[PDB]
Design a binder for this molecule. Structure first.
Ligand code: DGD
Ligand code: DGD
Ligand code: CLA
Ligand code: CLA
Ligand code: CLA
Ligand code: CLA
Ligand code: CLA
Ligand code: HEC
Ligand code: BCR
Ligand code: BCR
Ligand code: BCR
Ligand code: OEY
Ligand code: CL
Ligand code: CL
Ligand code: FE2
Lengths: 36, 442, 137, 334, 341, 81, 34
């Protein structure tokens, strides 16, 4: 059980930081008309 | 290029007229706070609990320790009047300043003062205004601190003796307690910040927050946004408006749950019992009655084989039986005397219940926050007679609704802000349709 | 049908004297009953102890009898258990206990008559529904 | 060309047959997890003590259920609003008795469905579209939040959130009417208006456009082949349609502007469903439908019944029977 | 130039409300069905048919007001004013529920008129008659719930009474007695109504967010012209959007709009069929396999068994008041009740 | 566009408000009186507050016959006289 | 030169006339006491 808990915590945190850093990487500039 | 029905969007880059909109609207807020209090007071009757009377503003004043004595017994109604009059009077001053700035004052400010004029895209000027308002907030939060410690104290429902107004001499400064709340789970038995159950922690947190707000207030005056911040945000009046609707909506959901669960800063003397509280009270009421008749309530096996009055929670604590087993996380001043370390204590139950405790439970049981839209108290199948709907239901529902729409407003303006900043809020360029220059998906 | 003297006529005491309320007194008492009592006694039940109700035939069997004005007005002053054996002003709103039940404070003696008037007239209009419970809603 | 920048470009690429995006990064795992747990549970989960009275309710196919009666049962009343992941149980067997699957499924679905809404914003940004299709979806998403999360919060227990099955759905909406008189609530009435209205306008708009297709085909072929994907000209005659509907009723009650007409189609069911989701959310704090039980009496004070009082007799029969073993005290306060 | 064509002429003139040959049926009957509902909700009781108050004059409000069904004793009588029941007396007619049949029949004939109107206007303007066909879905619902269903039963008494809460009582009746939610013909109705509402919202929101920029200002409404041949939103950007969000998307505007016709029309038709079954008490009330097991196995419980307990609660608690003519007397001991409640 | 006179022009006109400032209160007063005088009770058969039940009666006077129905309600009414 | 009395006139007054009247009766009704 304790092993599963760690695994899930790890998996979650991973996707969360993917998300936070995904949007911190110039997201306003990912559009087809005007980029900054 | 805006319609009449979006005509307030015609104030985006008219800084002077937009100042008046905000100050005229600030007057409306003070007006209502003033008139409403006068209305509630005009109808107050001290013989009756506040929560049989549809009061929502007076409960906020009595909570700060004005006009109440031990128990919540109303002692002096003059502080309620003084709060109403001053708020009402202050709204003309804002009303006056709002109409002046909307209609007669300069349309735009940046020609009259480099100080009061702003451009939304000036990231430096904007954080400076942020900084000023942060200090004002920090000041205000310390005001509550200052009341609690130097100007009378606050109503403390936990005080020994029924509750009483009490000066807070030892605010909790230990950061492991203060920020511990921010990391408690929001689920049952934990409650996130909603579970705060003592005024020392309340006062202490406002020392922290007022310091932080002044700290940051100064920060944002002195700094400009870093590059990683500059690249992640949209810098435009609508964009900041949306950011704020998001935060207000989130705050509104929090308040919804605060008034529905918390019986410390929303004491039940004033607001009515909580859902869980009333449910626990019913179990208390019939335990008390049946015991008087000679029932052995430790040992009484109910229909299901679970104890009829008392059972265990999933972690073993002894708790009230019946459906209210869901509500066993409840804590209130009238119940905690009965609790030992294993939960409810069977010897205290057989020996120590007091008349005042019986009385409280009978009252809270018959004042549970259930009620119809037209203010018939009780379950929905109940007949007319009792004109009662709990302040907690009126406050909980109204703010879910408001919270909900401001999240729509956040999505509404956030998305518009992204599209107008990129240049396609008005529709798709026929001669440059992005999708027609992309390859087909298949 | 209508609110006539016969129905407005109730017993004053156990001797069998009678008194005839005015319509005005009837509406007065109904009002005071909702203000001071219905939070536990809507419809003539007792939500916090359903075994004891306000049906006239229950009051008649109370010790002392309470199917009359005198008995009812006395109970609002010094309530007892159904057998009469212990005073219970501490857990039941009463004038003897108005310090701790603040609503019972502004009730005058005539107010008590009207309240007792209502309790005794209502079973005569609603019949079984008074103190019957949800089965008769 | 840096390894992160290339990942970011795949995530946000307009070239993937299914768009991913930063929102898609949370949505995909949480929906795959809720989906897979649901499919397994529906078929094979053992019975669940939903009401915490040690009376387990069988919900899956292998335990004697069919497509109509099966459900993933909500978690035990004994848990109330406590978090109950797998790792808090002494074993999967315990977790299954107390209804852990339901919590796992609803939290992951609510999350992935939240990100679904946001993913709709996102792709709209990447394609140069206007942004608000997602505002429309929030009406159903808000509905799912009310019955799976908001209602349990205010009643204090997930045992009272909506079951994940067809008969469980009806059970939830029967008990709801007994406890809240929801038919007599004005926000449910606006939901019915939103929902009936939506079906009406769908059929109207569909029949008005269909009525005014321009002849581009013979009798031996579908009229549908008169439209070619991406053609620039409209495929029906809007003034002939306005001409017919103006006269069916009267001129000014009919749109001749297709932008207002389509905006109207979107606003009506969205707004009405916001309200009826708000209705569930405020009845979560027990602000119930109108109560006119005994509001009409005669000169003597007899009760003169209306249809409200009949409604109440049926609400009573729902009340006294639901969860027949779970109540020990006379009022069902939650 | 005979008189018949002179009248054709005048009926079909272009005026603020078009009249037509269908007006002759439509207008009297629509005005009378409505005049009677407002007449009866404002002034008329249900005391003698149902034991209910039901007008503003009696003390009811807009939710509880209704024109109620006739007494069960009336059977399926047409209840004409001049008929053997009311014997010409207007006052007695009203007290017997005469206005219920009045509303229901002028209603039926008015719906005919309306649908003939949709046929009539469409022929003159030169459009296909698909709005008239769609209107069959409402007609079928009306005739099946208000006429066919009680004609199958003992009497008009058991049809819907015309009123908000009265209709609410009818919804609960069908749950307790017919277990109507379990009926697959209702479920197909639900998927069509909600499917329609879905389709309605999603198509309105797609168009509004795939618009071309044809004006300079922020109100996109100004930039449509009713006469323009050019389409006003991009089917190409809509199709790509939904293909990538949802996997499939429309590609054919004619199929799309025909599907908006098809979905809600068909669902109403399916529910009409179901209610026809219920005229006859031909319910999908039970699953036999479930009952056999639960009878033999008291540990066996599902949401199917729980819902029938609730149905059993509704029947015994509402029946005496709801069916006064049956003189149901249910002493307390026989009422089904769970513990404590 | 159909040749009738436009609504926006009829209800800004003096003549219109000169007629209807009479006809609209006359109707409101007319209907009021229909109630205040009691005629509405009589025209329609609707029981007054004092005549739903006979004094000590707690029985609905429910119609139970099709072809004697008229005479049935008439008998109930005389039970209130 | 418009007409005063049209089909439209009739339709309008067919509804309106009894509306106001009905509003009169329902107004009076709020003062009825049991
Ligand atoms: C930016 C993106 C944000 C990302 C956030 C993602 C992680 C967080 C997600 C939160 C999930 C919410 C679960 C709420 C469950 C619940 O039990 O929540 C309620 C809790 C309160 O918890 C209760 O707190 C109580 C505190 O009372 C205790 O202490 C009191 C102190 O006096 C009293 O003594 C009382 O008796 C005693 O019991 C007890 O602990 C209860 O057991 C416990 O249930 O609230 C809380 O934690 C406070 C905040 C709850 C807000 C939830 C609102 C959700 C609305 C979503 C809106 C959907 C909109 C749809 C959009 C379309
Ligand atoms: C045509 C006009 C245009 C109308 C357009 C549509 C807007 C609708 C507005 C309602 C119209 C009716 C208003 C007047 C009647 C009314 O309301 O009348 C009600 C009262 C005035 O009536 C009084 O209402 C009172 C209601 O009881 C209250 O007072 C009692 C006094 O003991 C008890 O304290 C009880 O607990 C308490 O709740 C009493 O019943 C009085 O007897 C009765 O006179 O007005 C009030 O309160 C005033 C309330 C105003 C503020 C409303 C905000 C409340 C926010 C709730 C949000 C939740 C939304 C969820 C919805 C789902
Ligand atoms: C701080 C809050 C805030 C602020 C400052 C704004 C500001 C603005 N909004 Mg946003 N908005 C908000 C919250 C806010 N909004 C919320 C919560 C939502 C969700 C509903 C929206 C949704 C929204 C939309 C959909 C649109 C705007 C638009 C606009 C702009 C023009 C608005 C205008 O002239 O309206 C004028 C006001 C009206 C026409 C009146 C509306 C009245 C409401 C709907 C009725 C409420 C009645 C009340 C509940 C009960 C009545 C009681 C009875 C007695 C009368 C302006 C910048 C427009 C825009 O994008 O422009 C850029 C636009 O199209 N807003
Ligand atoms: C909180 C509510 C609020 C506020 C504060 C404002 C404020 C404003 N609006 Mg918006 N507006 C609102 C709601 C609001 N609006 C709503 C609900 C709608 C939808 C109907 C609109 C639609 C709208 C449009 C369509 C336009 C505005 C415009 C404006 C601005 C210019 C007004 C002007 O010069 O008018 C002049 C008005 C008058 C001379 C009439 C008298 C008005 C006064 C203020 C009445 C006050 C009475 C009060 C009791 C007196 C107290 C006095 C005491 C304090 C001394 C102004 C700042 C305009 C703008 O941006 O201009 C460029 C514009 O075009 N508004
Ligand atoms: C946030 C609100 C706000 C903002 C940003 C402004 C900003 C401005 N005002 Mg406006 N104004 C406001 C509120 C506001 N005012 C109010 C409330 C009123 C009515 C009382 C007015 C009435 C008003 C008039 C009559 C005039 C202006 C003018 C001006 C401009 C010049 C001000 C100046 O030099 O004062 C410099 C600074 C001072 C004089 C210091 C004032 C000291 C204050 C009162 C103490 C602050 C204490 C605290 C923060 C307030 C809260 C107390 C409360 C909580 C109890 C400037 C753009 C002038 C203008 O543009 O003319 C063309 C002008 O003629 N204002
Ligand atoms: C009204 C309040 C307010 C507002 C609007 C801003 C706005 C801003 N701040 Mg300032 N700030 C404030 C208060 C505020 N600040 C206060 C009081 C302080 C003192 C601590 C600071 C200290 C501060 C610093 C030191 C810096 C900023 C920076 C910034 C900018 C970057 C914002 C950003 O990326 O955050 C978005 C947040 C993140 C990227 C990460 C947050 C991660 C947390 C964990 C999210 C949690 C959310 C969760 C769902 C809810 C539960 C809460 C949890 C703790 C339990 C932006 C202009 C930056 C800047 O550019 O300054 C010049 C910067 O470096 N702020
Ligand atoms: C024009 C459309 C129309 C339609 C279709 C109906 C239809 C109906 N009405 Mg409604 N009604 C209408 C207009 C209409 N009404 C108008 C304008 C009024 C107000 C005056 C009413 C007032 C009204 C009342 C008060 C009642 C009805 C009733 C009825 C129902 C019974 C009809 C019946 O038995 O007729 C039978 C008779 C015919 C169908 C006539 C046929 C004509 C024949 C073919 C000609 C005979 C010519 C003659 C013999 C030759 C010369 C003889 C010589 C002496 C000169 C039926 C649903 C009743 C109802 O709803 O009960 C529930 C009822 O009580 N109607
Ligand atoms: C709940 C807080 C109550 C309120 C408010 C009122 N009453 Fe009550 N009543 C309550 C209880 C728990 C009991 C039982 C007492 C016992 O014997 O243990 C009662 C009893 C009565 C009776 C006696 C009925 C009988 O059958 O003998 C009467 C007549 C009565 N109470 C009257 C009464 C009135 C008039 C009230 C308002 C002024 C009132 N009660 C308030 C609980 C509560
Ligand atoms: C701009 C605009 C707007 C807005 C405005 C506003 C909103 C304003 C405000 C206003 C305001 C905000 C006002 C207020 C004021 C106040 C006042 C003026 C007060 C008074 C006072 C007094 C006088 C007092 C008295 C008293 C006392 C002292 C005691 C007790 C008794 C009494 C109460 C009596 C609008 C939307 C309209 C429109 C457009 C434009
Ligand atoms: C007073 C008080 C207290 C205290 C409290 C406190 C101290 C608090 C704090 C709080 C805080 C401290 C908060 C925080 C916040 C944060 C947030 C809320 C954030 C958010 C974020 C976001 C929103 C993000 C976004 C994004 C992303 C994610 C990505 C990129 C892009 C962007 C940026 C957009 C207590 C309890 C003791 C008690 C009572 C009183
Ligand atoms: C039956 C009959 C008949 C007929 C009759 C009629 C035809 C009637 C009519 C009537 C009518 C025709 C009436 C009407 C009325 C109505 C009313 C009653 C109204 C009201 C309304 C209101 C109240 C509204 C209001 C409002 C609201 C509420 C909200 C929104 C807005 C408004 C403002 C709209 C005859 C003779 C043949 C004989 C036989 C029998
Ligand atoms: O409605 Mn009736 O109330 Ca809400 O709890 Mn008490 O009973 Mn049980 O758990 Mn599901 O259900
Ligand atoms: Cl159930
Ligand atoms: Cl219980
Ligand atoms: Fe369309």
């Amino acid at each position: 059980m304790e092993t599963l808990k760690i695994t899930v915590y790890i998996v979650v945190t991973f996707f969360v930081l993917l998300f936070v850093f995904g949007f911190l990487s110039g997201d306003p500039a990912r559009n087809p008309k005007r980029k900054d | 290029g805006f319609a009449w029905w979006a005509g307030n969007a015609r104030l985006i880059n008219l800084s002077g007229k937009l100042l008046g909109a905000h100050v005229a609207h600030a007057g409306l807020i003070v007006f209502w706070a003033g008139a409403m209090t006068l209305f509630e007071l005009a109808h107050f009757i001290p013989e009756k609990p506040m929560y049989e009377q549809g009061l929502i503003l007076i409960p906020h004043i009595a909570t700060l320790g004005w006009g109440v004595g031990p128990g919540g017994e109303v002692v002096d109604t003059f502080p309620f009047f003084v709060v109403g009059v001053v708020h009402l009077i202050s709204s003309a001053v804002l009303g006056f300043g709002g109409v002046y700035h909307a209609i007669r004052g300069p349309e735009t400010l940046e020609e009259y003062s480099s100080f009061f004029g702003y451009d939304w895209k000036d990231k430096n000027k904007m954080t400076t205004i942020l900084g000023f308002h942060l200090i004002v907030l920090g000041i205000g939060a310390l005001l509550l601190v200052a009341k609690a410690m130097f100007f009378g104290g606050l109503y403390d429902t936990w005080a020994p003796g029924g509750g009483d107004v009490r000066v807070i001499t030892n605010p909790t400064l230990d950061p492991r307690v203060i920020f511990g709340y921010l990391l408690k789970s929001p689920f049952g038995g934990e409650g996130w910040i909603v579970s705060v159950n003592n005024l020392e922690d309340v006062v202490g947190g406002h020392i922290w927050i007022g310091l932080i707000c002044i700290a940051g207030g100064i920060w944002h005056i002195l700094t400009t946004p870093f590059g990683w911040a500059r690249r992640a945000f949209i810098w435009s009046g609508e964009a900041y408006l949306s950011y704020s609707l998001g935060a207000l909506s989130m705050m509104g959901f929090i308040a919804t749950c605060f008034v529905w669960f918390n019986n410390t800063v929303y004491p039940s003397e004033f607001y009515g019992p909580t859902g869980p509280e009333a449910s626990q009270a019913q179990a208390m009421t019939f335990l008390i009655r049946d015991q008087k008749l000679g029932a052995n309530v430790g040992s009484a096996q109910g229909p299901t084989g679970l104890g009829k009055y008392l059972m265990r929670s999933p972690t073993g604590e002894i708790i009230f039986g019946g459906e209210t087993m869901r509500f066993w996380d409840f804590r209130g001043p009238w119940l905690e005397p009965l609790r030992g370390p294993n939960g409810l204590d069977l010897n205290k139950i057989k020996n120590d219940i007091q008349p005042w405790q019986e009385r409280r439970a009978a009252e809270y049981m018959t004042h549970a926050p259930l009620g119809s839209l037209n203010s018939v108290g009780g379950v929905a199948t109940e007949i007319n007679s009792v004109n009662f709907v709990s302040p907690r239901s009126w406050l909980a529902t109204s703010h879910f609704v408001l919270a909900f729409f401001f999240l729509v407003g956040h999505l509404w303006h956030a998305g518009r802000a992204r599209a107008a900043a990129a240049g396609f809020e008005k529709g798709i360029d026929r001669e440059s349709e992005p999708v027609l220059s992309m390859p087909s998906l298949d | 049908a209508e609110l006539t003297p016969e129905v407005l006529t109730v017993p004053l005491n156990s001797e069998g004297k009678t008194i005839t309320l005015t319509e005005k007194q009837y509406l007065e008492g109904k009002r005071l009953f909702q203000y001071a009592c219905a939070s536990c006694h809507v419809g003539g039940i007792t939500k916090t102890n359903p075994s004891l109700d306000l049906r006239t035939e229950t009051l008649a069997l109370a010790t002392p009898p309470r199917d009359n004005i005198e008995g009812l007005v006395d109970y609002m002053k010094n309530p007892t258990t159904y057998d009469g054996e212990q005073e219970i002003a501490e857990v039941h709103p009463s004038l003897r206990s108005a310090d701790i039940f603040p609503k019972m404070r502004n009730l005058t003696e005539k107010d008590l008559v009207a309240i007792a008037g209502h309790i005794l007239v209502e079973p005569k209009i609603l019949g079984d529904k008074w103190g019957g419970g949800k089965v008769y809603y | 060309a840096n390894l992160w920048e290339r990942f970011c470009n795949w995530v946000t690429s307009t070239d993937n047959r299914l768009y991913v995006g930063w929102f898609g990064v949370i949505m995909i795992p949480t929906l795959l997890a809720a989906t897979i747990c649901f499919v397994i549970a529906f078929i094979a989960a053992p019975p669940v003590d939903i009401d915490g009275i040690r009376e387990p309710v069988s919900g899956s196919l292998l335990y004697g259920n069919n497509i109509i009666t099966g459900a993933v049962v909500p978690s035990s009343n004994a848990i109330g609003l406590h978090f109950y992941p797998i790792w808090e149980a002494a074993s999967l067997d315990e977790w299954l008795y107390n209804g852990g699957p339901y919590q796992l499924i609803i939290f992951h679905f609510l999350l992935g469905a939240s990100c679904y809404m946001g993913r709709q914003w996102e792709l709209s940004y990447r394609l140069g579209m206007r942004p608000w299709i997602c505002v429309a979806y929030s009406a159903p998403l808000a509905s799912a939040f009310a019955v799976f999360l908001i209602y349990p919060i205010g009643q204090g227990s997930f045992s009272d959130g909506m079951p994940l099955g067809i008969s469980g759905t009806f059970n939830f909406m029967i008990v709801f009417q007994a406890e809240h008189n929801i038919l007599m609530h004005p926000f449910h009435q606006l939901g019915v208006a939103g929902v009936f209205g939506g079906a009406l306008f769908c059929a109207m708009h569909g029949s008005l456009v269909t009525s005014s297709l321009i002849r581009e085909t013979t009798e031996t072929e579908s009229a549908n082949y008169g439209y070619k994907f991406g053609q620039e000209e409209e495929t029906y005659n809007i003034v002939a349609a306005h001409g017919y509907f103006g006269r069916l009723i009267f001129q000014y009650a009919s749109f001749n502007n297709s932008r207002s007409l389509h905006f109207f189609l979107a606003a009506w069911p969205v707004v009405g469903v916001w309200f009826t989701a708000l209705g569930i959310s405020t009845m979560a704090f027990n602000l119930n439908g109108f109560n006119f039980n005994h509001s009409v009496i005669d000169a003597k004070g007899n009760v003169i019944n209306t249809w409200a009082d009949i409604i109440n007799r049926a609400n009573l029969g729902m009340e006294v029977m639901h969860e027949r073993n779970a109540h020990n005290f006379p009022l069902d306060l939650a | 130039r005979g008189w018949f064509d002179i009248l054709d002429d005048w009926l079909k003139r272009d005026r603020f409300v078009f009249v037509g040959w269908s007006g002759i049926l439509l207008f009297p009957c629509a005005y009378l069905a409505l005049g009677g509902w407002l007449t009866g909700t404002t002034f008329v009781t249900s005391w003698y048919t149902h034991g209910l108050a039901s007008s503003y004059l009696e003390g009811c409000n807009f939710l509880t007001v209704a024109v109620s069904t006739p007494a069960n004793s009336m059977g399926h009588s047409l209840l004409l004013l001049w008929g053997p029941e009311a014997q010409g007396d207007f006052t007695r007619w009203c007290q017997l529920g005469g206005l219920w049949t009045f509303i229901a029949l002028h209603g039926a004939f008015g719906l005919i008129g309306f649908m003939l109107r949709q046929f009539e206007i469409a022929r003159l303007v030169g459009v296909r008659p698909y709005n008239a066909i769609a209107f069959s879905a409402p007609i079928a619902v009306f005739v099946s719930v208000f006429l066919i269903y009680p004609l199958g039963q003992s009497s008009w008494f058991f049809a819907p009474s015309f009123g908000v809460a009265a209709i609410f009582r009818f919804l609960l009746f069908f749950q307790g007695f017919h277990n109507w939610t379990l009926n697959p013909f209702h479920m197909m109705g639900v998927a069509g109504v909600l499917g329609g509402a879905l389709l309605c919202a999603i198509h309105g929101a797609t168009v509004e967010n795939t618009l071309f920029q044809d004006g300079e200002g922020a109100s996109t409404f100004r930039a449509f012209n009713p006469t323009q041949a050019e389409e006003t939103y991009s089917m190409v950007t809509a199709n790509r959007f939904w293909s990538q969000i949802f996997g499939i998307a429309f590609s054919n505007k004619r199929w799309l709009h025909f599907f908006m016709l098809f979905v809600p029309v068909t669902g109403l038709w399916m529910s009409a069929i179901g209610v026809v079954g219920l005229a006859l008490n031909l319910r999908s009330y039970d699953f036999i396999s479930q009952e056999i097991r639960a009878a033999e196995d008291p540990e066996f419980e599902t949401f199917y068994t729980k819902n029938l307990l609730l149905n059993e609660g509704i029947r015994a608690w509402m029946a005496p008041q709801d069916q006064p003519h049956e003189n149901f007397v249910f002493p307390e001991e026989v009422l089904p009740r769970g513990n404590a409640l | 566009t159909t040749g009738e006179r436009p609504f926006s022009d009829i209800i800004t006109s003096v003549r219109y408000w000169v007629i209807h400032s009479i006809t609209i209160p006359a109707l409101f007063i007319a209907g009021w009186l229909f109630v205040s005088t009691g005629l509405a009770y009589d025209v329609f058969g609707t029981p007054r507050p004092d005549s739903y039940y006979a004094q000590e009666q707690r029985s609905i006077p429910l119609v139970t016959d099709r072809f004697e129905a008229k005479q049935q309600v008439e008998t109930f009414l005389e039970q209130l006289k | 030169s418009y007409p005063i009395f049209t089909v439209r006139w009739v339709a309008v007054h067919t509804l309106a006339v009894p509306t106001i009247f009905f509003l009169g009766a329902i107004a009076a009704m709020q003062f009825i006491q049991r």
